[PDB]
Short mmCIF file of N, CA and C in Angstrom, two decimals:
data_model
loop_
_atom_site.label_atom_id
_atom_site.label_comp_id
_atom_site.label_asym_id
_atom_site.label_seq_id
_atom_site.Cartn_x
_atom_site.Cartn_y
_atom_site.Cartn_z
N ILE B 1 -27.61 3.73 3.96
CA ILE B 1 -27.53 2.67 5.04
C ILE B 1 -26.24 1.78 4.95
N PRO B 2 -26.02 1.05 3.81
CA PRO B 2 -24.87 0.17 3.54
C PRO B 2 -23.59 0.99 3.41
N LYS B 3 -22.60 0.57 4.19
CA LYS B 3 -21.22 1.07 4.09
C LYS B 3 -20.69 1.02 2.66
N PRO B 4 -20.05 2.10 2.25
CA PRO B 4 -19.55 2.16 0.92
C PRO B 4 -18.21 1.38 0.77
N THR B 5 -17.78 1.24 -0.46
CA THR B 5 -16.50 0.61 -0.79
C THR B 5 -15.58 1.73 -1.31
N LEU B 6 -14.29 1.68 -0.95
CA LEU B 6 -13.33 2.68 -1.37
C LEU B 6 -12.20 1.95 -2.06
N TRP B 7 -11.91 2.34 -3.29
CA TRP B 7 -10.81 1.69 -4.00
C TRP B 7 -9.90 2.65 -4.69
N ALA B 8 -8.70 2.15 -5.05
CA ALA B 8 -7.76 2.94 -5.81
C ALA B 8 -7.45 2.23 -7.12
N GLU B 9 -7.36 3.03 -8.15
CA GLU B 9 -7.05 2.61 -9.54
C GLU B 9 -5.88 3.44 -9.94
N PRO B 10 -4.80 2.84 -10.46
CA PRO B 10 -4.38 1.50 -10.80
C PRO B 10 -4.27 0.60 -9.61
N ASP B 11 -3.74 1.17 -8.52
CA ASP B 11 -3.47 0.42 -7.33
C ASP B 11 -3.47 1.36 -6.16
N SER B 12 -3.23 0.81 -4.99
CA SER B 12 -3.07 1.68 -3.82
C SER B 12 -1.59 1.89 -3.42
N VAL B 13 -0.70 1.28 -4.18
CA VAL B 13 0.75 1.53 -4.08
C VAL B 13 1.16 2.22 -5.41
N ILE B 14 1.57 3.45 -5.31
CA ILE B 14 1.78 4.38 -6.44
C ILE B 14 3.21 4.85 -6.46
N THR B 15 3.89 4.81 -7.63
CA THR B 15 5.23 5.43 -7.69
C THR B 15 5.07 6.91 -7.64
N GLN B 16 6.03 7.52 -6.98
CA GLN B 16 6.07 8.86 -6.58
C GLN B 16 6.00 9.89 -7.65
N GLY B 17 5.66 11.08 -7.12
CA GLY B 17 5.28 12.29 -7.86
C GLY B 17 4.28 11.92 -8.92
N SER B 18 3.93 10.63 -8.99
CA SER B 18 2.76 10.24 -9.86
C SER B 18 1.26 10.31 -9.27
N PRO B 19 0.29 9.77 -10.07
CA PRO B 19 -1.23 9.83 -10.05
C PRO B 19 -2.14 8.52 -10.03
N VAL B 20 -3.36 8.64 -9.48
CA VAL B 20 -4.11 7.45 -9.13
C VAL B 20 -5.53 7.93 -8.80
N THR B 21 -6.54 7.08 -8.96
CA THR B 21 -7.86 7.58 -8.48
C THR B 21 -8.38 6.82 -7.33
N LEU B 22 -8.83 7.57 -6.32
CA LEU B 22 -9.61 6.99 -5.16
C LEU B 22 -11.12 7.09 -5.44
N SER B 23 -11.84 5.96 -5.44
CA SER B 23 -13.28 5.94 -5.79
C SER B 23 -14.06 5.49 -4.63
N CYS B 24 -14.98 6.33 -4.18
CA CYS B 24 -15.93 5.92 -3.11
C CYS B 24 -17.24 5.57 -3.78
N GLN B 25 -17.66 4.34 -3.55
CA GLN B 25 -18.77 3.74 -4.25
C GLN B 25 -19.86 3.49 -3.22
N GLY B 26 -20.91 4.31 -3.25
CA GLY B 26 -21.99 4.12 -2.31
C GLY B 26 -23.31 3.71 -2.96
N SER B 27 -24.43 4.21 -2.41
CA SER B 27 -25.72 4.06 -3.08
C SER B 27 -25.83 4.88 -4.36
N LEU B 28 -26.68 4.52 -5.33
CA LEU B 28 -26.91 5.42 -6.50
C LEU B 28 -27.66 6.70 -6.05
N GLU B 29 -28.30 6.59 -4.89
CA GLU B 29 -28.99 7.74 -4.30
C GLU B 29 -28.13 8.65 -3.41
N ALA B 30 -26.81 8.46 -3.41
CA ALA B 30 -25.94 9.28 -2.57
C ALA B 30 -26.09 10.70 -2.95
N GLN B 31 -26.26 11.55 -1.96
CA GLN B 31 -26.41 12.98 -2.11
C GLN B 31 -25.11 13.75 -1.90
N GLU B 32 -24.16 13.16 -1.15
CA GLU B 32 -22.88 13.81 -0.88
C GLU B 32 -21.96 12.71 -0.43
N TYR B 33 -20.68 12.83 -0.83
CA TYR B 33 -19.64 11.95 -0.35
C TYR B 33 -18.68 12.80 0.51
N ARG B 34 -18.09 12.20 1.55
CA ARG B 34 -16.99 12.85 2.30
C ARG B 34 -15.86 11.82 2.40
N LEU B 35 -14.68 12.26 2.04
CA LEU B 35 -13.48 11.42 2.12
C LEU B 35 -12.49 11.95 3.18
N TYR B 36 -11.87 11.09 4.01
CA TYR B 36 -11.03 11.56 5.11
C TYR B 36 -9.69 10.86 4.97
N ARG B 37 -8.67 11.44 5.59
CA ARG B 37 -7.28 10.87 5.57
C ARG B 37 -6.78 10.96 7.02
N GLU B 38 -6.33 9.84 7.60
CA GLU B 38 -5.50 9.91 8.81
C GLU B 38 -4.01 9.52 8.51
N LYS B 39 -3.08 10.36 9.01
CA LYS B 39 -1.61 10.12 8.87
C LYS B 39 -0.97 9.73 10.24
N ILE B 40 -8.57 13.10 11.93
CA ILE B 40 -8.76 12.98 10.51
C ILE B 40 -8.69 14.35 9.81
N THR B 41 -8.22 14.37 8.57
CA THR B 41 -8.36 15.48 7.63
C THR B 41 -9.45 15.17 6.59
N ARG B 42 -10.13 16.22 6.10
CA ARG B 42 -11.14 16.08 5.06
C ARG B 42 -10.57 16.47 3.70
N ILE B 43 -10.67 15.59 2.72
CA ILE B 43 -10.24 15.92 1.38
C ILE B 43 -11.21 17.02 0.82
N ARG B 44 -10.67 18.21 0.50
CA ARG B 44 -11.49 19.31 -0.04
C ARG B 44 -12.59 18.85 -1.00
N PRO B 45 -13.86 19.31 -0.75
CA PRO B 45 -15.02 19.04 -1.62
C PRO B 45 -14.79 19.19 -3.13
N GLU B 46 -14.06 20.25 -3.50
CA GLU B 46 -13.84 20.56 -4.93
C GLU B 46 -13.06 19.48 -5.64
N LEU B 47 -12.32 18.68 -4.85
CA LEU B 47 -11.50 17.53 -5.29
C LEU B 47 -12.28 16.23 -5.50
N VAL B 48 -13.41 16.11 -4.82
CA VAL B 48 -14.13 14.86 -4.85
C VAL B 48 -15.31 15.07 -5.82
N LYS B 49 -15.31 14.36 -6.94
CA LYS B 49 -16.32 14.51 -7.96
C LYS B 49 -17.07 13.24 -8.04
N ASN B 50 -18.35 13.29 -7.66
CA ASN B 50 -19.18 12.10 -7.52
C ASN B 50 -18.52 10.97 -6.70
N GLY B 51 -17.88 11.31 -5.61
CA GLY B 51 -17.20 10.25 -4.86
C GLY B 51 -15.79 9.89 -5.36
N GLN B 52 -15.44 10.38 -6.54
CA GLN B 52 -14.11 10.11 -7.13
C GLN B 52 -13.11 11.19 -6.77
N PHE B 53 -11.96 10.81 -6.22
CA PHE B 53 -10.88 11.71 -5.93
C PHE B 53 -9.71 11.21 -6.85
N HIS B 54 -9.54 11.86 -8.01
CA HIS B 54 -8.40 11.63 -8.89
C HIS B 54 -7.19 12.47 -8.46
N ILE B 55 -6.02 11.83 -8.27
CA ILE B 55 -4.86 12.55 -7.69
C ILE B 55 -3.83 12.83 -8.80
N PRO B 56 -3.19 14.06 -8.75
CA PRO B 56 -2.26 14.64 -9.75
C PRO B 56 -0.83 14.21 -9.52
N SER B 57 -0.30 14.52 -8.33
CA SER B 57 1.10 14.19 -8.01
C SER B 57 1.27 13.85 -6.51
N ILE B 58 1.56 12.57 -6.20
CA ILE B 58 1.53 12.11 -4.82
C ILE B 58 2.71 12.56 -3.99
N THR B 59 2.61 12.43 -2.65
CA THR B 59 3.56 13.13 -1.81
C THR B 59 3.45 12.54 -0.41
N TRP B 60 4.53 12.61 0.35
CA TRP B 60 4.37 12.39 1.79
C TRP B 60 2.92 12.68 2.32
N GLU B 61 2.35 13.85 1.96
CA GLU B 61 1.07 14.38 2.49
C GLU B 61 -0.19 13.61 2.06
N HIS B 62 -0.21 13.10 0.82
CA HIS B 62 -1.30 12.21 0.23
C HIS B 62 -1.35 10.76 0.65
N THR B 63 -0.23 10.26 1.12
CA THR B 63 -0.18 8.90 1.67
C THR B 63 -0.87 8.85 3.03
N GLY B 64 -1.41 7.70 3.36
CA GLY B 64 -2.07 7.48 4.64
C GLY B 64 -3.33 6.65 4.49
N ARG B 65 -4.16 6.62 5.56
CA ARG B 65 -5.28 5.74 5.63
C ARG B 65 -6.53 6.57 5.32
N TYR B 66 -7.25 6.18 4.28
CA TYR B 66 -8.46 6.91 3.78
C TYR B 66 -9.70 6.13 4.18
N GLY B 67 -10.79 6.88 4.42
CA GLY B 67 -12.10 6.23 4.63
C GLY B 67 -13.11 7.20 4.06
N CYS B 68 -14.25 6.71 3.62
CA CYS B 68 -15.29 7.57 2.96
C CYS B 68 -16.68 7.21 3.49
N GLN B 69 -17.57 8.19 3.43
CA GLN B 69 -18.96 7.92 3.80
C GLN B 69 -19.81 8.70 2.80
N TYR B 70 -21.10 8.36 2.64
CA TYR B 70 -21.93 9.19 1.81
C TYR B 70 -23.25 9.40 2.58
N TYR B 71 -24.01 10.38 2.15
CA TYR B 71 -25.31 10.67 2.80
C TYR B 71 -26.41 10.24 1.82
N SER B 72 -27.44 9.53 2.33
CA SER B 72 -28.60 9.18 1.55
C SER B 72 -29.73 8.83 2.59
N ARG B 73 -30.97 9.01 2.21
CA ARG B 73 -32.13 8.58 3.05
C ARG B 73 -31.98 9.13 4.48
N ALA B 74 -31.64 10.41 4.57
CA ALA B 74 -31.50 11.10 5.86
C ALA B 74 -30.49 10.48 6.84
N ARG B 75 -29.40 9.86 6.34
CA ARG B 75 -28.40 9.20 7.20
C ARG B 75 -27.08 9.44 6.46
N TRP B 76 -26.01 9.50 7.39
CA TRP B 76 -24.63 9.27 6.88
C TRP B 76 -24.34 7.85 6.97
N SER B 77 -23.75 7.29 5.91
CA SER B 77 -23.34 5.89 5.99
C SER B 77 -22.22 5.71 7.07
N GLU B 78 -21.93 4.47 7.43
CA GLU B 78 -20.71 4.21 8.22
C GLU B 78 -19.51 4.49 7.33
N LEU B 79 -18.37 4.73 7.97
CA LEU B 79 -17.09 4.81 7.20
C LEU B 79 -16.75 3.50 6.43
N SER B 80 -16.32 3.63 5.16
CA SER B 80 -15.78 2.51 4.38
C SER B 80 -14.61 1.81 5.17
N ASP B 81 -14.37 0.52 4.91
CA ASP B 81 -13.09 -0.08 5.34
C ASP B 81 -11.95 0.85 4.87
N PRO B 82 -10.87 0.99 5.65
CA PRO B 82 -9.79 1.93 5.27
C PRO B 82 -9.05 1.44 4.04
N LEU B 83 -8.70 2.38 3.18
CA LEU B 83 -7.81 2.15 2.01
C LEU B 83 -6.44 2.78 2.35
N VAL B 84 -5.37 1.97 2.37
CA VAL B 84 -4.04 2.50 2.70
C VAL B 84 -3.34 2.95 1.40
N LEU B 85 -3.01 4.23 1.28
CA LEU B 85 -2.46 4.74 0.00
C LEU B 85 -1.00 4.97 0.23
N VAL B 86 -0.19 4.22 -0.53
CA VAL B 86 1.27 4.21 -0.34
C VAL B 86 1.92 4.86 -1.55
N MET B 87 2.94 5.66 -1.29
CA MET B 87 3.80 6.11 -2.35
C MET B 87 5.17 5.46 -2.22
N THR B 88 5.72 5.06 -3.37
CA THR B 88 7.10 4.44 -3.42
C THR B 88 8.08 5.40 -4.06
N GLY B 89 9.38 5.07 -3.97
CA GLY B 89 10.41 5.95 -4.55
C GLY B 89 11.10 7.01 -3.75
N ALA B 90 10.90 7.06 -2.42
CA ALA B 90 11.37 8.20 -1.61
C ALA B 90 12.79 8.01 -1.11
N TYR B 91 13.34 6.79 -1.24
CA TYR B 91 14.67 6.46 -0.68
C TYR B 91 15.35 5.46 -1.62
N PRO B 92 16.69 5.37 -1.56
CA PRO B 92 17.41 4.38 -2.45
C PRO B 92 16.89 2.96 -2.25
N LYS B 93 16.84 2.20 -3.34
CA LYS B 93 16.33 0.83 -3.26
C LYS B 93 17.20 -0.07 -2.41
N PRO B 94 16.60 -0.93 -1.58
CA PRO B 94 17.36 -1.97 -0.92
C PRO B 94 17.63 -3.14 -1.89
N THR B 95 18.40 -4.13 -1.41
CA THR B 95 18.72 -5.34 -2.15
C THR B 95 17.98 -6.51 -1.58
N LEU B 96 17.42 -7.30 -2.47
CA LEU B 96 16.63 -8.46 -2.09
C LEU B 96 17.36 -9.70 -2.56
N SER B 97 17.50 -10.65 -1.66
CA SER B 97 18.22 -11.90 -1.97
C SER B 97 17.49 -13.08 -1.33
N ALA B 98 17.78 -14.29 -1.81
CA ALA B 98 17.18 -15.48 -1.26
C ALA B 98 18.27 -16.23 -0.56
N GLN B 99 17.94 -16.71 0.65
CA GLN B 99 18.91 -17.35 1.51
C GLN B 99 18.40 -18.74 1.76
N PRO B 100 19.13 -19.79 1.27
CA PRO B 100 20.43 -19.84 0.61
C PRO B 100 20.37 -19.65 -0.90
N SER B 101 19.19 -19.80 -1.49
CA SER B 101 19.09 -19.86 -2.96
C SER B 101 17.66 -19.54 -3.39
N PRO B 102 17.50 -18.97 -4.61
CA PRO B 102 16.15 -18.73 -5.09
C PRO B 102 15.58 -19.93 -5.81
N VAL B 103 16.35 -21.03 -5.82
CA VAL B 103 15.82 -22.32 -6.40
C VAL B 103 15.26 -23.12 -5.25
N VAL B 104 13.95 -23.36 -5.26
CA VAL B 104 13.29 -23.92 -4.13
C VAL B 104 12.53 -25.13 -4.60
N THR B 105 12.68 -26.22 -3.89
CA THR B 105 11.94 -27.46 -4.11
C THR B 105 10.45 -27.30 -3.84
N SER B 106 9.64 -27.93 -4.70
CA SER B 106 8.19 -27.79 -4.66
C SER B 106 7.77 -28.18 -3.27
N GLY B 107 6.98 -27.32 -2.65
CA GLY B 107 6.46 -27.52 -1.31
C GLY B 107 7.40 -27.01 -0.23
N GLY B 108 8.60 -26.56 -0.63
CA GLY B 108 9.55 -26.04 0.32
C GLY B 108 9.38 -24.56 0.62
N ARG B 109 10.27 -24.05 1.44
CA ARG B 109 10.21 -22.69 1.98
C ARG B 109 11.56 -22.07 1.74
N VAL B 110 11.61 -20.74 1.69
CA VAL B 110 12.85 -20.06 1.58
C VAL B 110 12.76 -18.76 2.41
N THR B 111 13.91 -18.26 2.82
CA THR B 111 14.00 -16.95 3.45
C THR B 111 14.44 -15.89 2.45
N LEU B 112 13.71 -14.78 2.35
CA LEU B 112 14.15 -13.66 1.49
C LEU B 112 14.61 -12.57 2.47
N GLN B 113 15.73 -11.97 2.11
CA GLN B 113 16.36 -10.96 2.92
C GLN B 113 16.42 -9.66 2.16
N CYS B 114 16.10 -8.60 2.88
CA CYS B 114 16.12 -7.27 2.28
C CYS B 114 17.21 -6.57 3.07
N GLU B 115 18.12 -5.93 2.34
CA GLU B 115 19.26 -5.31 2.94
C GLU B 115 19.53 -3.92 2.33
N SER B 116 19.88 -2.98 3.20
CA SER B 116 20.10 -1.58 2.78
C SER B 116 21.44 -1.02 3.29
N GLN B 117 21.99 -0.08 2.54
CA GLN B 117 23.17 0.64 2.94
C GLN B 117 22.83 1.70 4.01
N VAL B 118 21.59 2.19 4.00
CA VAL B 118 21.10 3.17 4.99
C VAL B 118 20.08 2.44 5.85
N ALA B 119 20.12 2.69 7.14
CA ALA B 119 19.29 1.97 8.08
C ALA B 119 17.85 2.45 7.91
N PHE B 120 16.92 1.51 7.89
CA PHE B 120 15.47 1.78 7.87
C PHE B 120 14.75 1.35 9.14
N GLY B 121 13.69 2.08 9.48
CA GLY B 121 12.82 1.68 10.60
C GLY B 121 12.13 0.34 10.41
N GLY B 122 11.75 0.03 9.18
CA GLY B 122 11.19 -1.28 8.91
C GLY B 122 11.29 -1.60 7.40
N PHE B 123 10.99 -2.84 7.06
CA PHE B 123 11.04 -3.29 5.66
C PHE B 123 9.72 -3.88 5.23
N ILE B 124 9.46 -3.85 3.94
CA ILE B 124 8.20 -4.43 3.45
C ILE B 124 8.58 -5.45 2.39
N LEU B 125 7.95 -6.62 2.36
CA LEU B 125 8.12 -7.58 1.23
C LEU B 125 6.78 -7.64 0.52
N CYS B 126 6.75 -7.47 -0.82
CA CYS B 126 5.50 -7.63 -1.58
C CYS B 126 5.64 -8.72 -2.61
N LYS B 127 4.61 -9.55 -2.71
CA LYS B 127 4.47 -10.57 -3.76
C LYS B 127 3.65 -9.92 -4.86
N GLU B 128 4.14 -10.08 -6.09
CA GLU B 128 3.60 -9.45 -7.29
C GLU B 128 2.92 -10.48 -8.18
N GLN B 129 -0.24 -7.53 -2.09
CA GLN B 129 0.14 -8.60 -1.16
C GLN B 129 1.50 -8.33 -0.45
N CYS B 130 1.48 -7.42 0.51
CA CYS B 130 2.74 -7.00 1.16
C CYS B 130 2.74 -7.35 2.65
N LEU B 131 3.94 -7.60 3.19
CA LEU B 131 4.12 -7.95 4.61
C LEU B 131 5.18 -6.99 5.16
N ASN B 132 4.99 -6.44 6.36
CA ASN B 132 6.11 -5.70 6.97
C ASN B 132 6.87 -6.53 7.95
N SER B 133 8.12 -6.12 8.19
CA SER B 133 9.02 -6.80 9.09
C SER B 133 8.84 -6.23 10.55
N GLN B 134 9.42 -6.85 11.59
CA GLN B 134 9.52 -6.13 12.92
C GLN B 134 10.14 -4.70 12.94
N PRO B 135 9.47 -3.74 13.59
CA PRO B 135 10.00 -2.38 13.66
C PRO B 135 11.25 -2.33 14.55
N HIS B 136 12.24 -1.51 14.15
CA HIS B 136 13.39 -1.18 14.99
C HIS B 136 13.45 0.32 15.18
N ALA B 137 13.27 0.77 16.42
CA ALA B 137 13.19 2.21 16.68
C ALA B 137 14.51 2.92 16.41
N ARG B 138 15.63 2.24 16.67
CA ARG B 138 16.92 2.78 16.25
C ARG B 138 17.23 2.45 14.76
N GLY B 139 16.44 1.57 14.15
CA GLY B 139 16.61 1.26 12.70
C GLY B 139 17.51 0.03 12.50
N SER B 140 17.34 -0.67 11.37
CA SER B 140 18.24 -1.80 11.01
C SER B 140 18.53 -1.81 9.52
N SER B 141 19.63 -2.46 9.14
CA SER B 141 20.02 -2.46 7.75
C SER B 141 19.50 -3.72 7.02
N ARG B 142 18.82 -4.61 7.73
CA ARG B 142 18.23 -5.78 7.06
C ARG B 142 16.98 -6.40 7.74
N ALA B 143 16.17 -7.10 6.95
CA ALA B 143 15.02 -7.80 7.48
C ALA B 143 14.99 -9.10 6.75
N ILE B 144 14.40 -10.12 7.38
CA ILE B 144 14.19 -11.42 6.68
C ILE B 144 12.75 -11.86 6.75
N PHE B 145 12.30 -12.57 5.73
CA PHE B 145 10.89 -12.98 5.57
C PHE B 145 10.88 -14.41 5.10
N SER B 146 9.96 -15.20 5.64
CA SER B 146 9.85 -16.59 5.25
C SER B 146 8.74 -16.67 4.16
N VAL B 147 9.03 -17.38 3.05
CA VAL B 147 8.06 -17.49 1.92
C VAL B 147 7.85 -18.99 1.65
N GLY B 148 6.60 -19.34 1.37
CA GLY B 148 6.26 -20.68 0.96
C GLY B 148 5.22 -21.22 1.89
N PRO B 149 4.85 -22.51 1.73
CA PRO B 149 5.39 -23.47 0.76
C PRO B 149 5.21 -23.03 -0.69
N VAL B 150 6.24 -23.21 -1.51
CA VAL B 150 6.15 -22.75 -2.86
C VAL B 150 5.60 -23.88 -3.72
N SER B 151 4.76 -23.52 -4.68
CA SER B 151 4.20 -24.52 -5.60
C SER B 151 4.76 -24.30 -6.97
N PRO B 152 4.80 -25.37 -7.79
CA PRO B 152 5.32 -25.23 -9.15
C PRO B 152 4.33 -24.58 -10.12
N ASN B 153 3.05 -24.57 -9.74
CA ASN B 153 1.97 -24.07 -10.57
C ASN B 153 1.70 -22.57 -10.47
N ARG B 154 2.44 -21.87 -9.60
CA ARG B 154 2.31 -20.40 -9.41
C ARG B 154 3.66 -19.66 -9.57
N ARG B 155 3.62 -18.38 -9.93
CA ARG B 155 4.83 -17.55 -10.00
C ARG B 155 5.06 -16.83 -8.67
N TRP B 156 6.33 -16.70 -8.29
CA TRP B 156 6.74 -16.27 -6.97
C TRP B 156 7.71 -15.10 -7.16
N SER B 157 7.17 -13.90 -7.36
CA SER B 157 7.93 -12.73 -7.76
C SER B 157 7.75 -11.79 -6.59
N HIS B 158 8.87 -11.24 -6.14
CA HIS B 158 8.82 -10.38 -4.95
C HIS B 158 9.68 -9.15 -5.17
N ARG B 159 9.27 -8.07 -4.51
CA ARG B 159 10.17 -6.95 -4.38
C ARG B 159 10.12 -6.51 -2.91
N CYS B 160 11.16 -5.78 -2.47
CA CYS B 160 11.17 -5.25 -1.10
C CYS B 160 11.45 -3.75 -1.05
N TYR B 161 11.07 -3.13 0.06
CA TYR B 161 11.20 -1.70 0.29
C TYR B 161 11.65 -1.44 1.74
N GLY B 162 12.26 -0.27 1.93
CA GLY B 162 12.50 0.23 3.33
C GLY B 162 11.50 1.36 3.59
N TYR B 163 11.18 1.59 4.87
CA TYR B 163 10.46 2.82 5.23
C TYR B 163 10.87 3.29 6.64
N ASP B 164 10.51 4.55 6.94
CA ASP B 164 10.73 5.20 8.25
C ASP B 164 9.47 5.03 9.11
N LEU B 165 9.61 4.71 10.39
CA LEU B 165 8.45 4.36 11.23
C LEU B 165 7.47 5.52 11.38
N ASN B 166 7.98 6.73 11.31
CA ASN B 166 7.19 7.95 11.43
C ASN B 166 6.44 8.34 10.15
N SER B 167 6.67 7.61 9.06
CA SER B 167 5.94 7.80 7.82
C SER B 167 5.76 6.46 7.07
N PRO B 168 4.98 5.58 7.66
CA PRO B 168 5.00 4.19 7.16
C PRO B 168 4.36 3.97 5.78
N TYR B 169 3.68 4.96 5.22
CA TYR B 169 3.00 4.87 3.92
C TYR B 169 3.84 5.47 2.83
N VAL B 170 5.06 5.86 3.20
CA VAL B 170 6.05 6.31 2.24
C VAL B 170 7.27 5.30 2.22
N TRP B 171 7.49 4.69 1.06
CA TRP B 171 8.43 3.57 0.99
C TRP B 171 9.57 3.96 0.04
N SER B 172 10.66 3.23 0.19
CA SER B 172 11.77 3.38 -0.77
C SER B 172 11.41 3.11 -2.23
N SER B 173 12.34 3.39 -3.16
CA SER B 173 12.23 2.76 -4.47
C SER B 173 12.24 1.20 -4.27
N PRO B 174 11.54 0.45 -5.12
CA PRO B 174 11.54 -1.00 -4.95
C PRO B 174 12.90 -1.63 -5.23
N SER B 175 13.22 -2.69 -4.47
CA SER B 175 14.38 -3.54 -4.90
C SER B 175 14.11 -4.07 -6.33
N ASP B 176 15.21 -4.50 -6.99
CA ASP B 176 15.02 -5.31 -8.17
C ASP B 176 14.15 -6.51 -7.86
N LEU B 177 13.44 -6.97 -8.89
CA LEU B 177 12.57 -8.13 -8.71
C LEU B 177 13.35 -9.39 -8.42
N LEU B 178 12.83 -10.22 -7.55
CA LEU B 178 13.42 -11.53 -7.35
C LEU B 178 12.36 -12.53 -7.60
N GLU B 179 12.67 -13.50 -8.50
CA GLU B 179 11.73 -14.59 -8.75
C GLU B 179 12.26 -15.96 -8.30
N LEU B 180 11.38 -16.82 -7.77
CA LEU B 180 11.87 -18.12 -7.33
C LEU B 180 11.72 -19.10 -8.50
N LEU B 181 12.65 -20.06 -8.55
CA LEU B 181 12.48 -21.23 -9.47
C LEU B 181 12.12 -22.39 -8.66
N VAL B 182 10.97 -22.98 -9.00
CA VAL B 182 10.62 -24.27 -8.49
C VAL B 182 10.82 -25.28 -9.65
N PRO B 183 11.92 -26.07 -9.62
CA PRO B 183 12.37 -26.93 -10.73
C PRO B 183 11.27 -27.95 -11.10
N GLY B 184 11.05 -28.16 -12.39
CA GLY B 184 10.07 -29.21 -12.78
C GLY B 184 10.66 -30.02 -13.90
#
């Protein structure tokens, strides 16, 4: 009856040609699990062991939006909330900078800019929680993101990525980390 939960361990953002487990968690009385991917495709039965889909080496093809259901008490459950599985590392890293400065006054805001030598369809900023930038169908070499208000009691560590609009779950190698200083 109750919709299952679908999660990824370590995370749902995975560095490339690497591995991760997708876990569909339903009733203890589940008789069968089915896992689907939209880029629906069905993840082969032999791959899903008790609702667990452990992955060997990720790829353009494994990235995308997953949902799972299980059967119990003569019903298929509803589909789980979608789990978005992203692979990183497919393109050269962009550069991440703070405009005007990564030193930010407590309660203030800053703009972080992601810039690339090769044009990308869009950019992603993640706090180490990711945000994408406006799409450009012809592509752009930079995106900007507003961050804050920043507090002195939290860490503000970000990386950015580029991606192609036709494969949005496949991202560049991450930019170098950028951390903000809130002076105290």
